Amino acid sequence: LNRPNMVSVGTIVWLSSELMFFAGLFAMYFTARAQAGGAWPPEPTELNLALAVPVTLVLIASSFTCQMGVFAAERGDVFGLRRWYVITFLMGLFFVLGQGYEYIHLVEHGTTIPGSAYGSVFYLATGFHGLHVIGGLVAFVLLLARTKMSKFTPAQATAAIVVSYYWHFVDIVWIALFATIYFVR
Amino acid sequence: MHIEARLFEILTAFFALAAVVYAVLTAMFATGGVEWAGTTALVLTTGLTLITGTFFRFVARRLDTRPEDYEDAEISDGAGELGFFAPHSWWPILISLSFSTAAVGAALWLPWLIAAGVAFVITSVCGLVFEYYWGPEKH
Amino acid sequence: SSALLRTGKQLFDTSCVSCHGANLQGVPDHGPSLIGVGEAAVYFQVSTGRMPAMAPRKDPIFDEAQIDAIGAYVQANGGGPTVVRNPDGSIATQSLRGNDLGRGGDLFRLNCASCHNFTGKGGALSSGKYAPDLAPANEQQILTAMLTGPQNMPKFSNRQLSFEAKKDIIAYVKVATEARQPGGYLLGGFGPAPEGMAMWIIGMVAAIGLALWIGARS
Amino acid sequence: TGVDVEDVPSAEWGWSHMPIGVMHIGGLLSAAFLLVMMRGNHVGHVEDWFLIGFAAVIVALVGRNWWLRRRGWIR
Amino acid sequence: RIKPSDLGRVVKRKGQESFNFGEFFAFTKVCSHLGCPSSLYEQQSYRILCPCHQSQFDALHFAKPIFGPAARALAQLPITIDTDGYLVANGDFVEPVGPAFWERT
Amino acid sequence: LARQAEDIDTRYHPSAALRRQLNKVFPTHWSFLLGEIALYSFVVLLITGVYLTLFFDPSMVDVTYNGVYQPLRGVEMSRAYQSALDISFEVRGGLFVRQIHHWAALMFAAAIMVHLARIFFTGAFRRPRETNWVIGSLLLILAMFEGYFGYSLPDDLLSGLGLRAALSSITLGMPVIGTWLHWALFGGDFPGTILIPRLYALHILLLPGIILALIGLHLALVWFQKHTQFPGPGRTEHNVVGVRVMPVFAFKSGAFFAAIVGVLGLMGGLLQINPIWNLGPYKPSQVSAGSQPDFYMMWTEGLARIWPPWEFYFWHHTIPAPVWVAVIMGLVFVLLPAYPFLEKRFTGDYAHHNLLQRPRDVPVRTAIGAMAIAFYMVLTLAAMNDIIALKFHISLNATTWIGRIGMVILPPFVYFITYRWCIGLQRSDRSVLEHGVETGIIKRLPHGAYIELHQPLGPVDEHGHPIPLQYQGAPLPKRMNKLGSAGSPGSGSFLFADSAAEDAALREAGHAAEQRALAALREH
Numbered sequence A: 001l002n003r004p005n006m007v008s009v010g011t012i013v014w015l016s017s018e019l020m021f022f023a024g025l026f027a028m029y030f031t032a033r034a035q036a037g038g039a040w041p042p043e044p045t046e047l048n049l050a051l052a053v054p055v056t057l058v059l060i061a062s063s064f065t066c067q068m069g070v071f072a073a074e075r076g077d078v079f080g081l082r083r084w085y086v087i088t089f090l091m092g093l094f095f096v097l098g099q100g101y102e103y104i105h106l107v108e109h110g111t112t113i114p115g116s117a118y119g120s121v122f123y124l125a126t127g128f129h130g131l132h133v134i135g136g137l138v139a140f141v142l143l144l145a146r147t148k149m150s151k152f153t154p155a156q157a158t159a160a161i162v163v164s165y166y167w168h169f170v171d172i173v174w175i176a177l178f179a180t181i182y183f184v185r
Numbered sequence B: 001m002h003i004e005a006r007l008f009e010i011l012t013a014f015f016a017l018a019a020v021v022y023a024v025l026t027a028m029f030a031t032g033g034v035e036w037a038g039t040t041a042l043v044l045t046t047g048l049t050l051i052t053g054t055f056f057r058f059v060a061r062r063l064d065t066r067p068e069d070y071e072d073a074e075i076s077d078g079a080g081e082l083g084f085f086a087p088h089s090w091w092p093i094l095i096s097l098s099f100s101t102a103a104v105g106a107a108l109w110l111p112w113l114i115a116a117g118v119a120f121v122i123t124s125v126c127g128l129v130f131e132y133y134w135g136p137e138k139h
Numbered sequence C: 001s002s003a004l005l006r007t008g009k010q011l012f013d014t015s016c017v018s019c020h021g022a023n024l025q026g027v028p029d030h031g032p033s034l035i036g037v038g039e040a041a042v043y044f045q046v047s048t049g050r051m052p053a054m055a056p057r058k059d060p061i062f063d064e065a066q067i068d069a070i071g072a073y074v075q076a077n078g079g080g081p082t083v084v085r086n087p088d089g090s091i092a093t094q095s096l097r098g099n100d101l102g103r104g105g106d107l108f109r110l111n112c113a114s115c116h117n118f119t120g121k122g123g124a125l126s127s128g129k130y131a132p133d134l135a136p137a138n139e140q141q142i143l144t145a146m147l148t149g150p151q152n153m154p155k156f157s158n159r160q161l162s163f164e165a166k167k168d169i170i171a172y173v174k175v176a177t178e179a180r181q182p183g184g185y186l187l188g189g190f191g192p193a194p195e196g197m198a199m200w201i202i203g204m205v206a207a208i209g210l211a212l213w214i215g216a217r218s
Numbered sequence D: 001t002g003v004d005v006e007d008v009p010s011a012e013w014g015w016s017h018m019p020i021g022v023m024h025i026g027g028l029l030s031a032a033f034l035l036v037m038m039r040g041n042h043v044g045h046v047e048d049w050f051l052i053g054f055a056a057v058i059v060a061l062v063g064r065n066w067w068l069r070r071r072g073w074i075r
Numbered sequence E: 001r002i003k004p005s006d007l008g009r010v011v012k013r014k015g016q017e018s019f020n021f022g023e024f025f026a027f028t029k030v031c032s033h034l035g036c037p038s039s040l041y042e043q044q045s046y047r048i049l050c051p052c053h054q055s056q057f058d059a060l061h062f063a064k065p066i067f068g069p070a071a072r073a074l075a076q077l078p079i080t081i082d083t084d085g086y087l088v089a090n091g092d093f094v095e096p097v098g099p100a101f102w103e104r105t
Numbered sequence F: 001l002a003r004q005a006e007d008i009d010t011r012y013h014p015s016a017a018l019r020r021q022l023n024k025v026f027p028t029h030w031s032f033l034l035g036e037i038a039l040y041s042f043v044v045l046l047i048t049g050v051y052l053t054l055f056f057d058p059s060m061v062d063v064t065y066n067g068v069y070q071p072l073r074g075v076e077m078s079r080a081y082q083s084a085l086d087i088s089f090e091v092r093g094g095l096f097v098r099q100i101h102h103w104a105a106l107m108f109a110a111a112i113m114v115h116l117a118r119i120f121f122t123g124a125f126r127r128p129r130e131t132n133w134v135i136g137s138l139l140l141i142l143a144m145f146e147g148y149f150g151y152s153l154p155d156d157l158l159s160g161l162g163l164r165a166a167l168s169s170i171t172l173g174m175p176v177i178g179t180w181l182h183w184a185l186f187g188g189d190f191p192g193t194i195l196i197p198r199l200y201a202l203h204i205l206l207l208p209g210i211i212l213a214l215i216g217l218h219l220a221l222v223w224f225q226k227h228t229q230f231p232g233p234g235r236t237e238h239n240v241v242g243v244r245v246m247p248v249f250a251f252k253s254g255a256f257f258a259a260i261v262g263v264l265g266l267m268g269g270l271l272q273i274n275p276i277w278n279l280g281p282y283k284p285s286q287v288s289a290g291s292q293p294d295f296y297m298m299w300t301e302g303l304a305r306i307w308p309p310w311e312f313y314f315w316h317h318t319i320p321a322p323v324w325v326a327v328i329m330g331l332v333f334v335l336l337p338a339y340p341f342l343e344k345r346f347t348g349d350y351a352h353h354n355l356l357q358r359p360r361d362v363p364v365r366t367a368i369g370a371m372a373i374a375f376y377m378v379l380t381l382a383a384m385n386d387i388i389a390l391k392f393h394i395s396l397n398a399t400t401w402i403g404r405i406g407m408v409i410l411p412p413f414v415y416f417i418t419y420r421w422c423i424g425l426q427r428s429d430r431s432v433l434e435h436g437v438e439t440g441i442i443k444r445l446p447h448g449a450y451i452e453l454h455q456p457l458g459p460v461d462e463h464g465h466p467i468p469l470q471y472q473g474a475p476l477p478k479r480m481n482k483l484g485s486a487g488s489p490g491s492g493s494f495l496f497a498d499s500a501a502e503d504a505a506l507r508e509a510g511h512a513a514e515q516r517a518l519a520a521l522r523e524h
Ligand SMILES: CC(C)=CCC/C(C)=C/CC/C(C)=C\CC/C(C)=C/CC/C(C)=C/CC/C(C)=C/CC/C(C)=C\CC/C(C)=C\CC/C(C)=C/CC1=C(C)C(=O)c2ccccc2C1=O
Pocket: C193, C196, C197, C200, C201, C204, C205, C208, F113, F114, F116, F117, F120, F295, F299, F332, F335, F336, F339, F369, F372, F373, F375, F376, F380
């Protein structure tokens, strides 16, 4: 019974709504870039590209690791799932720490939220993505703790799958934000 | 499912058409060029409907006929055992109370209230997720 | 170019006349006269943002030396107090910090702590009104605040509170708002209410959680 | 004292009855206490109207319960 | 010190019509409820607020209480100036100061 | 240590009382540790107070500070305030110790209140134990006043205001005795010279001694009248089911003691309480905005705030307002210890009881208790008027009137809701007794009908429906996973699996031991 999965449909439609949320943020960003003529990233601000590439590659590797974990989950063994999801958690934590470090080193000598328009839109666009990543980390921890406390049933597999492609959606919207902010300018 | 996918494809086609038309009509004939705020909303609502429609399309191509999708069928076809539908639970009201605490702590700028609200939200969501998986007590 | 208050009476006419009058006469519906007041009142009211009002503190509207413009324009119509200046013409700061924090703190506890707090947190007055926090106000704002006597706050002249007394009070306030808490995380600056809350919501939940873990339930 | 089991299932395991006269008299006394609190230093009358409005609802509820119990629609 | 603008809303309790010197009034500072310092003075409502339990006295109406468990007015002190121009007391309080007891106020 | 043990045995020969105390059985419910919490808090209080007495000087003479804390140099203060400042700033580890002391006092009070709530709601005060209830009530009163006298010792502005207002000007207002009590206690008018030494003597010697004697008597009565228990599988009014002291109970008690000490140390190191240096020495001319006593006197303060100004003036005399606060507080302190006798007079039940009641089986008492707790919460929140009206933007007069009206309309509303809620819980229990436990699975029953696959708790009749059980005062399961339904995860560590033989053996022996425990406790 119930040949198409239900949790899958729910997660998919919710991810669509989240995409619309990020649409609102993008619309905020593109305006105030048309108004600032010339060096629209103001003089105290210049982005350090020597740090933003490794964290993006780390996030992509995280996506690969999560897909491997789902492959392991579809056949009923919990330990491969646990290993791949621990790896994914560690890589996401590294990404968040790198982003926070760049925030510190960038607020150190210039750009602030109340000090500019570019700084405002930049921090607003990237901090919400950071919050989404932190939520994904919490979901990973909860899923592992839940696999710890009973035998492996198909419901656990469905939960793993939906958490997986939530993570995929996250690290795709990150690619969009990165290509828009750091390269297009 | 074949009709849901077709509905979402119709919607995605119309939204993409409208987005492109608006973009190219405001590139010219407008005061300051491309409008940049309706354009974005339109492309990303197109993307929303596209994601949903593509998922439904894959699930339809990977599926055999279903008593719901199938005419010609009788009630003895669906005779079986449905999923698990949760009976009584009291965690939703606690989740809502925690989220409301965090929200009122964000309205009036009070960081301690925001921290307490976030902690309570984590606790209540953990309680909701684990409700039907805790085992018997170990003594 | 001090003979130029044509700016000044260019911003007042487009941001104030609806509530104070074209001649600074106090529209009998909303605003006071603003004649006896001086540059210090305008400085404190505008720089903190309480001015032009729809009164709480908000974001300021005017700078780029136009607070000076409105202040000079208002001073030209009366004889109120003026803002302190340093040998450059700007407004001063750190040398109004008395080498003495004991006297400043005793004066604060006698005159100021009744409405604000022991250490300058807020305090509630009757029927709405409250006394705000003293953390984000700079030195000239503190001086002009206790010199001009804003709404429902008493007015401390330079004869009952001399200039040393004011400088020492400023120094005590700025030190009390910027000192560490050498006992751990202070729970807001108030008395036993945050302490009781923290007890009930941290220590008791830890104790009851450990009691639930150790002992069985039946 | 006594209550039938079909209203309170665990009527034999503990105290489960409070006589209704207690509740009626308590409601009337609380209304009177709310009313007598117009004696003071209240300059302004915004507070007196809340006192009068909360004392009318209590009396209304008590009277409704008494009248329905008197005609057998309750118990 | 009361602003010269009002000076027409004063009520001047029955026995103390001449206890003020112009615009100076000099009430006591010990709340007539339980004895905390009633020091919160709002300058343009003319209200004195006791911070211990929040009573409110009306500085323009012989310090009459207008909110809270406070029930008796604050005591007023008579003042004047001496031959040199300093403020001096023109006598004593007409009644005891502070909380009440069995004997009298 | 055979030689030493035998020589102790020929000199004392206990060997039978030790066996009688090593075999005592104690019930194991998480709710039976709320008294241990208070006991351990009291022990920590004793230790830290004995440490503190080596540095405190309780005088009221005036000195000039001339210390290390610079923003107070040259200020004239009493000797007690200076001694407290010296403890805080000039003894290595003194601030830590006094913060532990204050946090332990707070935890003492909170644990006592939670324990009282348990005792009241479960009905553990009935026929054999009214006197133990009375002793507990006396302990509560003494703890309140001891904490008050304690935090009034290092006389600073806040403690001085509290002393002045409450003690001086409520004792001063009593109808006839009044000023006589005030002058006997203070030695004169309010700011004296004998107040702080007298409070010091009362606080370190007398009240701790009385509390220690009463705690000894309390624990003796609990030891010789064996503990109560909840109804269950093998529980009767004539036996105690639990674990023996010998290996287990002492171990659990000691581990709980260590964990409570750990929590107290952590929160005494990381959170700040009573920073007396931000205040100043007490002076009768200056005041601040907070005021506020510790959370166990806030109800007294709130009652004084929201009580209307009703005074009586007759011939040559005066009865002020705080007299009302006095009689109401006395009435509360008299109605607390005399409750079991009231309930036994009203319900007319005088039998021995050793099995507890679930709070849902006694709706009227549960509603009374909820009403009292709501009243207490209203009185406590009415004490932080200033903080509430400042942080949350509300008028001050508005909060006063909100408290003044809530004091009358919240208790009855809470009573009504609690009564209906208790009966609803009873009905929910009866439904799962009549039918089975809902599993949450749905079927379609080829003629298009939806059923929900209940699961019986006992025997079944001919046509598959379970025969209804009878209620026995014990809790019933509501979730299928609490019964063993979906369990038995893998037996790895966290990332690597174990062998299959180990997994099978461990699972199978665990199942066997569970079944044996069940079958053993049923049969007795
Ligand atoms: C059980 C009942 C009280 C017995 C009734 C017996 C008989 C009726 C005696 C008459 C007494 C009547 C007339 C007046 C009552 C008031 C008076 C007696 C006060 C004396 C003190 C004493 C009796 C205390 C009463 C019982 C006590 C309040 C138990 C409450 C605690 C229990 C039930 C639940 C606690 C659970 C806890 C771990 C989580 C709660 C989290 C927080 C929100 C608790 C709420 C909370 C509390 C409780 C604070 O005290 C508090 C103080 C300062 C700041 C904040 C808070 C605060 O947030």
